[PDB]
Design a binder for this molecule. Sequence first.
Ligand SMILES: [Zn+2]
Lengths: 37, 140, 204, 58, 173
Amino acid sequence: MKVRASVKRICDKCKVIRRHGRVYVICENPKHKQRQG
Amino acid sequence: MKTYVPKQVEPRWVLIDAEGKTLGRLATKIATLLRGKHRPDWTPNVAMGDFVVVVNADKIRVTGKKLEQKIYTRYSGYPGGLKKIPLEKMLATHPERVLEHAVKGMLPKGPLGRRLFKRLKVYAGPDHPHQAQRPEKLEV
Amino acid sequence: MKGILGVKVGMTRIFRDDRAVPVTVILAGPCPVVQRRTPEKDGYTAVQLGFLPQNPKRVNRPLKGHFAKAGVEPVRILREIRDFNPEGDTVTVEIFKPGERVDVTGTSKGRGFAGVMKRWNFAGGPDSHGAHKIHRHPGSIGNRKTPGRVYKGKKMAGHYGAERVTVMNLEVVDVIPEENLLLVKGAVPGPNGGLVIVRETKKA
Amino acid sequence: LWIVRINAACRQHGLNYSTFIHGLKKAGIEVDRKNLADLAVREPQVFAELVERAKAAQ
Amino acid sequence: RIGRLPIPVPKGVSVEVAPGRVKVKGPKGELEVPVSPEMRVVVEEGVVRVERPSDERRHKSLHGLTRTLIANAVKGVSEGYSKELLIKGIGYRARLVGRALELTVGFSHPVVVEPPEGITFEVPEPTRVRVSGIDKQKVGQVAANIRAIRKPSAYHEKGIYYAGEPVRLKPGK
RNA sequence: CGCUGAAAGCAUCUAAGCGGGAAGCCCGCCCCAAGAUGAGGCCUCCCGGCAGCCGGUAAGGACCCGGGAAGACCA
RNA sequence: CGAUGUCGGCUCGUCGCAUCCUGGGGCUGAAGAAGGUCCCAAGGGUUGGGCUGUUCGCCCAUUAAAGCGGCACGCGAGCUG
Ligand SMILES: [Zn+2]
């Protein structure tokens, strides 16, 4: 879970979802899994 | 022609169903009745507001996420004595203390205020030991 | 939750399986029941025990009526076991048995106005190198101007001991029914003859 | 105090303080907060008539 | 294209709208859908539907979710729901014991699962397991707990799998 | 970290929901505690001359000893 | 500036978390073990000694770890000097 402020798509499978109010970059790739903060 | 001063009269009990009503608003009206600023013979320096009994206080409702974002906090005087309380937890523990608190915040401080709050009577659930006092129902 | 009143008669070690296990000896029984806290009548469940008996000329009228309401002999001390409904009319050591874990409560030996070291194990100050008249003082007690006060519960002098104390999870080394004696491993709070109360342990 | 008592007595007749004031002002009456208050406490019928001309102002 | 979609209601299915809740009794069993009071139920024989009173985000949302949830319900009491799990890893297996399920995937002791209300623990093999019942979400919650017990491995196919759950494990040593 | 899942035909842990989830928080353990002036509750005991007044008084208490692992004193 | 006593040590703590260990978890160039990184987490702990006035630091032996800081670089109507 890459936590950061510039959550962004990396691969096309990088899919953004505003979960619990936060912005999570959920993807099939575990590495692209990002949490904005 | 001095301004009129009223005679000390028998305050009239009043029942209020807290069920469904909004916390802050209903507590406000409770404060208005409790101050007795509904009576044309009102006077500031005298506790002549009406005794109040509220039922189903546990049934109170609150807008938004205040169930968990509102934190009744308290203080012991001891280091780290800041005891935070979510609103829901305060409901399950002591529903009546919620309304009693949110109305205590709305009354004038000082001794007259305290006697006013002592004129207050919150009761979770429907009942109350005041039938002899004749708590008149009054929709708000 | 079973529990009986008792008195601390002294400590002693015994030899149980080639082990000098120290114990305390507690004359517990026989505790007669005098009143039962029922929730409909007293808001909760518990009982009230008499130990030891009292000279009838040493009992005020109110207590006497309190005994006549039961069928109990006038008794010196009277207490309550919370959440305990003894079936019989007199709780004894029979409720307990060896190996059973208990928790015992009694008043510690009152150490009067205890100093700060004995009361809280503060280090005090040094005994040489120039320490001027503060060999057993607690040193500082707070901070400078912020907060410029002293917190609640700052460990200071006062009465160490002489208070209710509950040491817990002890072992019932042995029961002596004919004597109403009880042998509990470890030490018990209070002086010899000090009143104490034994109960089932809340541990597991 | 006068605005308080007057506001109470007026609310016992449906309207609030500001509405009553606006009425009497529009109603061409000049009686002040003191005498209004004393009427509302002493003359519920007379003060009632004042509210009558007050809503009458609307 | 989803709340727009009608919810066909084939018997044997009892559908009955009370305020904020439906009631559907099928052959598998019975249940109720908590329903959006803003949302409307087109209780029609052969098909019951849902109608959003507006077109806000909240009413296409509650409309679609209401429809999907209801149809899942009638599918529940009507024909229930089931889920299979492929226990893998050498020696890892399971077998029913009474109602609860025995399952051993390499701990200091095997692990048993209690089936809540109904939640069927069918043990076709020790390798694979089924869990069924009226409820769609509750099934996936139970089996969810199951795969939560001994999840798949990163470096081996040694662990609980969902029926259809693929296995994309990275290489190792 | 999830089940169900629409908005958004798919998917989505969330937006309706339900769950799991930490030496964390609440309770739970001990201690204090009704000045908790909201002064709580149970048991027992007590019963006139001039909202009171006074009276000796009831119950009871106190003072006074003789002490006490109680204690500076007091308690 | 008709006085707010200044480094250090001691005693006593209390608090923040920007967490050193302990708890939970994500990702991994995570085979396991051990790790790295980040996330949540302040309940508790955070050793002893040599040198030096020292704080600091180095070293010694450990430890789960040997946290960083605020509190007038806390604390002299508490001590030392
Ligand atoms: Zn990606």
